[PDB]
């Protein structure tokens, strides 16, 4: 019939990784990952925002465990840690365009 | 994706982040419910429940419609659940 209700702790920490991937930003960098890493100069080129907002955008993100950065070479690259998380994105994109 | 796309997909987001919204999707991704049915499925006060479903409802998210005796409420489409279920199944890591 009826779930469930997870705890308590998954519903606060479900709730904390929506808020977020809520800002038109976020989820412009999350699209950007999910085709490629991507260090920061290329997510400047790519969105036109200057870097210091996407670097506050990416801390963010970052905290929030959706993303993670690593050498690679000579620059650091930006990583979803898991592109499942795009698909949170993409069905919010979805929604919003059947509207 | 336009701005305002991606304008309206944040809010619908943000509408999305409170603890009780998840778990009144969750229900409703089952079935749909009348408001007692999830009052006794949360643990939780009538009006508050309703409160949290008046900004589903103006958020896009819910709608309800008759159906004989009762007012049903139902999810609007089933990316909505996918949202939820999947922030849930990543949240559940740790």
New interface residues.
Partial sequence: ??????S?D??????????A????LR??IV?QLKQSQRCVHELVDALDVPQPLVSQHLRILKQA?VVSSERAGREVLYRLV?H??A???V?????????
């Fill in positions: 019939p009826a779930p469930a209700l997870p308590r998954v519903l606060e920490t479900a709730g904390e990784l929506l808020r991937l809520a800002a038109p989820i412009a699209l465990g898991d499942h998380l698909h949170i994105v069905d919010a994109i979805a929604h919003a365009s059947e509207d």
